Amino acid sequence: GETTDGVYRVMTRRLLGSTQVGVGVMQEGVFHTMWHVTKGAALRSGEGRLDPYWGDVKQDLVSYCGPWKLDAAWDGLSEVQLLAVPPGERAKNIQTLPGIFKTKDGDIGAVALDYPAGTSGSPILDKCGRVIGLYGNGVVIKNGSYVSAITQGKRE
Amino acid sequence: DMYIERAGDITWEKDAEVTGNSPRLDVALDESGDFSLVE
Ligand SMILES: CCC(=O)Nc1cncc(C(=O)Nc2ccncc2C)c1
Numbered sequence: 124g125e126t127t128d129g130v131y132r133v134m135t136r137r138l139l140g141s142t143q144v145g146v147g148v149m150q151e152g153v154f155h156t157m158w159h160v161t162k163g164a165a166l167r168s169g170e171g172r173l174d175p176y177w178g179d180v181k182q183d184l185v186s187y188c189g190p191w192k193l194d195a196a197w198d199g200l201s202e203v204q205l206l207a208v209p210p211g212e213r214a215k216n217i218q219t220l221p222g223i224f225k226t227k228d229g230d231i232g233a234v235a236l237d238y239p240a241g242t243s244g245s246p247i248l249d250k251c252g253r254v255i256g257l258y259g260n261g262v263v264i265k266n267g268s269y270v271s272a273i274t275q276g277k278r279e
Numbered sequence: 280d281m282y283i284e285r286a287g288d289i290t291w292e293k294d295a296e297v298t299g300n301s302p303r304l305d306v307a308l309d310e311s312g313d314f315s316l317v318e
Contacts, residue, residue, distance in 0.1 A: 125283070125285060127285060128288075128289070129285055129286075129287060129288050129289055130285075130286050130287050130288075130289055131283040131284060131285050131286055132283065132284045132286050133281055133282075133283055134281065134282050134283070134284060135280075135281050136280070137280075137281075144281065146286070147283070148289065149283075149285075150289075154283065158312065159312070161281060164281055165280075165281075166281050166282060166283055167280055167281070167282035167283070168282065168283050173283070179312075180311065180312045181308070181310060181311075181312045182312065183312035202297075204291055204292065204295055206287070206289060208286045208287070213286075213287075214286045214287035215296070216290075216291075216292040216295040216296075217295060217296055217297075217298060217299070218295045218296070218297040218298075219297070219298065219299035219301075220299070220301045221301060222300065222301040222302040222303055222304065223301075223302075223303045223304070224304055224306040224314070225303065225304065225305050225306065226306055226307065226308055227307070228308070233302070233304065234299060235299045235300045235301070235302055236298070236299050246289060248289065248290075248291055249291075250291055251291070252289060252290050252291045254289060260312065260314065261306075261314050262304065262306055262314045262315065262316055264302065264304070264316070270302060270304060272314065
């Protein structure tokens with residue numbers, strides 16, 4: 124299967140036509156997506172197969188072929204880019220200053236950009252091109268728009 | 280059976296379409312990994 128680093132669409136034939144259910148990141152031979160995209164199911168790449176290795180419904184993250192590899196964090200100051208991959212449309216970078224989710228357990232970066240649910244798993248980058256987390260888990264606000272956490276996993 | 284198709288490199292791109300606000304929101308994270316607005 125295709126193991127080249129970069130950003131990937133996650134597709135299903137289980138509904139009408141080919142439907143994009145989300146997006147993920149291939150890095151160092153590990154595929155990283157959000158849990159709500161795959162539900163921990165196996166994936167095809169060519170005639171190659173990708174088996175889940177790690178996941179956590181609460182973090183809403185999952186890794187394939189190996190452990191979570193993405194260790195970069197928002198610095199709390201700088202602007203970032205959502206490498207959005209929306210259904211049927213080309214990969215498009217969108218630059219933004221993250222807001223903040225305040226929680227009992229701590230503060231998390233949040234990005235206020237409004238894309239379809241199939242964009243879930245699109246990566247968020249720092250100025251050096253490093254993935255600081257994934258887009259697609261958050262909240263629907265006073266306005267009706269979507270606000271996503273910058274969801275990053277731990278690297279052990 | 281879900282499958283993956285490459286959609287690009289992971290690169291910062293100078294002069295990209297800048298947009299979005301920066302809201303500070305009070306949120307709760309449930310056991311099912313669903314966020315919600317505390318108020
Ligand atoms: C048009 C505004 C909008 O809702 N878009 C949107 C953008 N990114 C993710 C979702 C989403 O719903 N994810 C999600 C989280 C947690 N559990 C399930 C699911 C599908 C939705």
